[PDB]
Amino acid sequence: PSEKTFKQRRTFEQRVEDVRLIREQHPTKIPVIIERYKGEKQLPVLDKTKFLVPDHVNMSELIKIIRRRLQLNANQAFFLLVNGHSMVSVSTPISEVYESEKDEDGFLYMVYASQET
């Protein structure tokens, strides 16, 4: 097992350089880190945590992709918290979410949990 998050496993400079390369090789993708909330207990762990998401995909669509990857029941509660906090618009394309919520290192960080607060 690894206890470390992506940010704790890669230096700031390594992450900035990852984003630059992804930017040049995938100009219409947003680089997103999706991790399980640090003490989450109902939801399983995702197999992978690092994704490229097409600019046009909105949060509603991303949520349903991740839920399906987690093999969740339709009724199970799930929230995807961007840059620390519940997103109010779910129609917004992720390219625009990125503009308001991207980290200083250039990644977009999300955590998933069974509740919003």
Partner: peptide, 24 residues
């Protein structure tokens, strides 16, 4: 979600290499 790949040395023969992949 971490992987450590070890190559086994001293393995002849021949053109095939052995790796032990530890996934933790």
């Amino acid at each position: 979600s971490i992987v450590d790949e070890f190559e086994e040395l001293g393995e002849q023969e021949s053109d095939i290499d052995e790796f032990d992949l530890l996934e933790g």
